[PDB]
């Protein structure tokens, strides 16, 4: 049931792409009458042996994952061999939470934002049981199944903690989403459950800005860094700002208990950040107290 051949895949539209890989909406049509299922297909552009290995790892991670708030794995297309693999994932027509929230902001109140928030916490909790560190938690990488269900997607950066260590050190990072990254991820390239918790704080921030462009994490951090950028890089400026307890401001509208959860997630000390279970319990209870 998981054997997808190249001759049956039909291109419909490009959903998005990056520097090394792309995501397309395709129809898997073995009966060639256009009745076949519509799927999301990932492929790579210019592949080195370690980019190939990363993709093989992502596929292994995706194989083992079954959860209501995690995007469904379907299979792989082996037709062109190891060198040119295609990852087959479920096509979600409502797209990313980032885009979905901007579009439907008038029908998405605080109670709904917290509904999404705790689904992300439960998904992340399940990830933790397998020692998986996501590394790319952001509303752009959360996908929408319907008005009442969101799913964590893009597992392209996801790593597996060693059996005896609580962090994973990435030996060669490319372009990173630095305005979602914990300080220790920036300074030491160390990724853990606690760095995912930091990132979840930024996701919660995202949700309560309603994806207002001027209030996005890059926008506010660049504003906070200032016009005197001479002498050092942006990442260096961000490191000093975070070290000095500079943080993303409270959106004017955001409940104080919600902003508190953010600032706790944004603790400099990895050992003082809350757990995803605690986060789920605190979010569910604030959501209950609202209605
Ligand atoms: C296949 C790559 C991947 C890799 C991974 O590790 C986890 C999830 C995915 C993935 C990423 C994106 C999507 C989407 C979508 O992008 N949907 C949409 C719909 C409509 C529009 C306009 N744009 C967009 N649907 N299923 C998706 C699965």
Curated annotation (Swiss-Prot):
Subunit description: Interacts with EPOR, LYN, SIRPA, SH2B1 and TEC. Interacts with IL23R. Interacts with SKB1. Interacts with STAM2. Interacts with IFNGR2 (via intracellular domain). Interacts with LEPR (Isoform B). Interacts with HSP90AB1; promotes functional activation in a heat shock-dependent manner. Interacts with STRA6. Interacts with RHEX; this interaction occurs in a erythropoietin (EPO)-dependent manner. Interacts with ASB2; the interaction targets JAK2 for Notch-induced proteasomal degradation. Interacts with MPL/TPOR.
Modified residues (Phosphotyrosine): 28, 126, 132, 167-168
Active-site positions on this chain: 136
Disease link: Chromosomal aberrations involving JAK2 are found in both chronic and acute forms of eosinophilic, lymphoblastic and myeloid leukemia. Translocation t(8;9)(p22;p24) with PCM1 links the protein kinase domain of JAK2 to the major portion of PCM1. Translocation t(9;12)(p24;p13) with ETV6. Budd-Chiari syndrome: A syndrome caused by obstruction of hepatic venous outflow involving either the hepatic veins or the terminal segment of the inferior vena cava. Obstructions are generally caused by thrombosis and lead to hepatic congestion and ischemic necrosis. Clinical manifestations observed in the majority of patients include hepatomegaly, right upper quadrant pain and abdominal ascites.
Protein kinase domain segment(s): 9-284
List of residues binding ATP: 15-23, 42
Family to which this protein belongs: Belongs to the protein kinase superfamily. Tyr protein kinase family. JAK subfamily.
This protein's name: Tyrosine-protein kinase JAK2
Tissue: Ubiquitously expressed throughout most tissues.
Organism ancestry: Eukaryota, Metazoa, Chordata, Craniata, Vertebrata
Residues represented out of the complete protein: 841 to 1131 of 1132
UniProt comment concerning the protein's domains: Possesses 2 protein kinase domains. The second one probably contains the catalytic domain, while the presence of slight differences suggest a different role for protein kinase 1.
Post-translational modification as stated in the protein's UniProt record: Autophosphorylated, leading to regulate its activity. Autophosphorylation on Tyr-28, Tyr-126 and Tyr-132 in response to growth hormone (GH) are required for maximal kinase activity. Also phosphorylated by TEC. Phosphorylated on tyrosine residues in response to interferon gamma signaling. Phosphorylated on tyrosine residues in response to a signaling cascade that is activated by increased cellular retinol.
Annotated function: Non-receptor tyrosine kinase involved in various processes such as cell growth, development, differentiation or histone modifications. Mediates essential signaling events in both innate and adaptive immunity. In the cytoplasm, plays a pivotal role in signal transduction via its association with type I receptors such as growth hormone (GHR), prolactin (PRLR), leptin (LEPR), erythropoietin (EPOR), thrombopoietin receptor (MPL/TPOR); or type II receptors including IFN-alpha, IFN-beta, IFN-gamma and multiple interleukins.
Subcellular location: Endomembrane system; Cytoplasm; Nucleus
